[PDB]
Amino acid sequence: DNCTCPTNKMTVCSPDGPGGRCQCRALGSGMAVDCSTLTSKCLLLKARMSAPKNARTLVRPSEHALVDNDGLYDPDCDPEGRFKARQCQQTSVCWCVNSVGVRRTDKGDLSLRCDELVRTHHILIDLRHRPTAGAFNHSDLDAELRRLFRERYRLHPKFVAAVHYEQPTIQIELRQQTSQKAAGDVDIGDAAYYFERDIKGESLFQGRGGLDLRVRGEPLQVERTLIYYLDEIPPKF
Amino acid sequence: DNCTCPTNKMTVCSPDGPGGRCQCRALGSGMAVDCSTLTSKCLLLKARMSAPKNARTLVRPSEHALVDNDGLYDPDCDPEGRFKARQCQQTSVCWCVNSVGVRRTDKGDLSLRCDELVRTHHILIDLRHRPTAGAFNHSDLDAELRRLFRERYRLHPKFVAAVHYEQPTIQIELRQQTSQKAAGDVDIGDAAYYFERDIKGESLFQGRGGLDLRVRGEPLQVERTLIYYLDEIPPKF
Ligand SMILES: *[C@@H]1O[C@H](CO[C@@H]2O[C@@H](C)[C@@H](O)[C@@H](O)[C@@H]2O)[C@@H](O[C@@H]2O[C@H](CO)[C@@H](O)[C@H](O)[C@H]2NC(C)=O)[C@H](O)[C@H]1NC(C)=O
Ligand SMILES: *[C@@H]1O[C@H](CO)[C@@H](O)[C@H](O)[C@H]1NC(C)=O
């Protein structure tokens, strides 16, 4: 039936529409999905944290259990798929987040109010690949990288601000102001999240398990990944 | 090379000992390694987060920037390769960690004291596999996961507490309290770390290739992984 969501396999899809139309929904949220573009980072985080409703013979994580990524959580998303500017956990604990969903203010109680969703317009991606004889020249790197950020992540070439290379560290700087973003353009935060997941081996694409990055045909593997976010307003700590 | 470190490729090994003995050392720490058994998660983190700190062609994050670290950092390890109970970053931020290195207290200053290394005695590995037409035989899947932990990660069978399956979710439940671990046992936290690295396409082995999971010969592809750690003393947030 080929009923699939190529740009998001973290979904459920079934040919049960009128005429058998393939209908799909975001796992963990029941939100709608565009199977021909990037799904917003907030819905993807909800999908990753989704619990089955009936555990059956599965067990559930203890309330006191912890996870490696201490910034990882199940988020609340608005109808357009953006993070709600105020996020909460443990019933009362509450804080504000930016457009990428990173805590930006001191934590408080339910009385906290976040004026707006501060937009992250600048993203630094620092990759440390394992040493290899292929010191692919910067030119060939920018070429496949911008190609990927345009043809895989569907981000527009101006929003790729710059790429750097000093072995064994590759660096991609992304810039997208609200003034430069036409509606229906892919946001840099979503393409950056798809990139982070492709690097770390949990690709969100259909049939792809990770980033099969090949410059001039030689595979390149990344050891360490560090991503920094710069938004319109400085964090208020 | 005859001189390799099969259980840990995050090493440099040279045939420069007496007579040509393969002498190996861990990247990022200089520590000795046992290439017949799994290396400590603390030392492997030191190998993964070693920082060149070069800025000739590279740019540094803005002072106001926030970071998605995945909770990763370069940690302090004791002579036995265990995490030191106390961990610091940015020189002044400091906290306690458990035996798997996860933060189990609120961040403090350089005055913070951690009494002991709290044992992580329970681990839950929740995999979500890429859907297939039919479910795997629960007995065959259970047997393959058990021999995987017995042979590849060299974990004793008694430390695998349970294996759950409810398509498409697989769950592996490891248990190893302080009283149940004799010296020379592989630790469940290390077996879990090697498993997670294998699944994400970053196998730690030097000559076993990679993880190609096969139940009854059918490929098993993990789309999502999540790991939960439970300590013998509840976290003090
Ligand atoms: C999963 O497989 C096991 C292993 O049996 C194999 O697969 C069977 C389909 C068949 O081809 C056997 O010859 C293979 O050895 C299944 O265990 C068997 O169960 C059958 C049916 O009840 C029983 O007659 C046999 O004694 C078992 N086979 C042996 C030799 O262990 C199991 O039932 C399969 N589960 C599912 C979900 O189908
Ligand atoms: C980079 O190196 C490759 C090696 O195959 C070569 O083909 C290419 O022309 C080089 N380009 C530059 C700009 O150095």
Numbering used by the authors:
A (entry chain D), B (entry chain A): 32 to 268
Please give the exact wording used by the authors of the publication that reports this structure.
For crystallization a mutant variant of Trop2 ectodomain was used where two putative N-glycosylation sites were mutated (N120Q, N208Q) while the two other sites were left intact (N33, N168) to achieve adequate balance between protein sample homogeneity and solubility. Four copies of Trop2 ectodomain were located within the asymmetric unit (chains A to D) which form various assemblies as discussed in the next section. Domains ND (Q31–L69), TY (T70–L148) and CD (V149–T274) form a triangular arrangement where each domain forms contacts with the other two. The fold of the ND and TY is stabilized by three disulfide bridges with the same cysteine–cysteine connectivity as observed in EpCAM. Interestingly, the TY-loop adopts two distinct conformations: one in chains A and B, and the other in chains C and D. Electron density corresponding to the attached carbohydrate moiety was identified only at N168 and modelled as N-acetylglucosamine (NAG) in chains C and D, and as a short branched NAG-[a-(1-6)-FUC]-NAG in chains A and B (GlycoCT notation, FUC stands for fucose). Of these five assemblies, only assembly 1 has a very large interface area of 2474 Å2 (average of interfaces between AD and BC). A large portion of the dimer interface is formed between TY-loop of one subunit and the concave β-sheet of the juxtaposed CD (βCD). The angle defined by the β-sheet and the dimer interface plain is in Trop2 very narrow (10°) and the ND is almost colinear with the plain. As noted, in EpCAM dimer dissociation/destabilization is needed to reveal the α-site, while in the tighter Trop2 dimer the α-site is accessible even in the dimeric form.
Trop2 (trophoblast cell surface antigen 2) is cell-surface transmembrane type-1 glycoprotein expressed in normal epithelial cells of various tissues. Trop2 and EpCAM are, in terms of amino acid sequence identity, very similar (48%). They are composed of three topological regions: ectodomain representing the largest portion of the protein, a single transmembrane region, and a short cytosolic tail. Analogous proteolytic cleavages were also demonstrated for Trop2 where cleavage at the α-site by TACE (also known as a disintegrin and metalloproteinase (ADAM) 17) within the ectodomain is followed by intramembrane cleavage by the γ-secretase complex.
